[PDB]
Amino acid sequence: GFKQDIATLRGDLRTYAQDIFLAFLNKYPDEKRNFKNYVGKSDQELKSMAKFGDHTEKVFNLMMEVADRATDCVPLASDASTLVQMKQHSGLTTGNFEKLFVALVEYMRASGQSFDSQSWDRFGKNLVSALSSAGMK
Numbered sequence: 001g002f003k004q005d006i007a008t009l010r011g012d013l014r015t016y017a018q019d020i021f022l023a024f025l026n027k028y029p030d031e032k033r034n035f036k037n038y039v040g041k042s043d044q045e046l047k048s049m050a051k052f053g054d055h056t057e058k059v060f061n062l063m064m065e066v067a068d069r070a071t072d073c074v075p076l077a078s079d080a081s082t083l084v085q086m087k088q089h090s091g092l093t094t095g096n097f098e099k100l101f102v103a104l105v106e107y108m109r110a111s112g113q114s115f116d117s118q119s120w121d122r123f124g125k126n127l128v129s130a131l132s133s134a135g136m137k
């Protein structure tokens with residue numbers, strides 16, 4: 001289930017992080033409007049740009065901690081507060097986070113592997129709710 005999935009992702013986190021984030025950016029190309037440096041780049045290119053590698057590993061390191069601190073796929077309100085308050089996320093709305101989690105669940109659904117994709121779908125919805133409650137637009 002969900003807690004085992006966190007252990008599976010953590011065991012190859014840099015590969016999973018890059019591959020899910022690319023799934024996100026390829027499913028929702030207008031989302032590169034938050035990442036202008038990523039325009040006109042193939043996946044293999046993006047993987048070779050330092051700020052892509054280093055945002056994406058830091059995104060997934062923190063997302064796995066937030067997932068690990070959750071109860072029944074419901075994140076801590078403190079985790080949502082921390083995420084909202086991040087100066088680098090001033091541009092963003094809950095829509096940006098919803099799209100990341102849609103791509104993450106679709107990635108799990110298409111993988112060869114017994115991920116609990118329904119728990120990730122609830123985690124993504126619950127995080128978006130928590131972000132709204134913490135002050136995200």
Ligand code: HEM
Nearest residue numbers: 031034035051055058059060062063088089092096097100
């Ligand atoms: C659980 C979800 C997310 C986490 C945990 C997260 C985490 C982070 C972290 C830790 C940083 C600091 C990394 C660094 O610059 O050294 C950062 C920066 C940033 N995040 Fe996020 N982020 C998340 C979702 C998003 C989403 C969905 C977007 C846009 C759709 C986004 C856009 C950005 C941008 C634009 C920056 C700074 C510029 C850059 O990425 O190069 N983040 N994020």
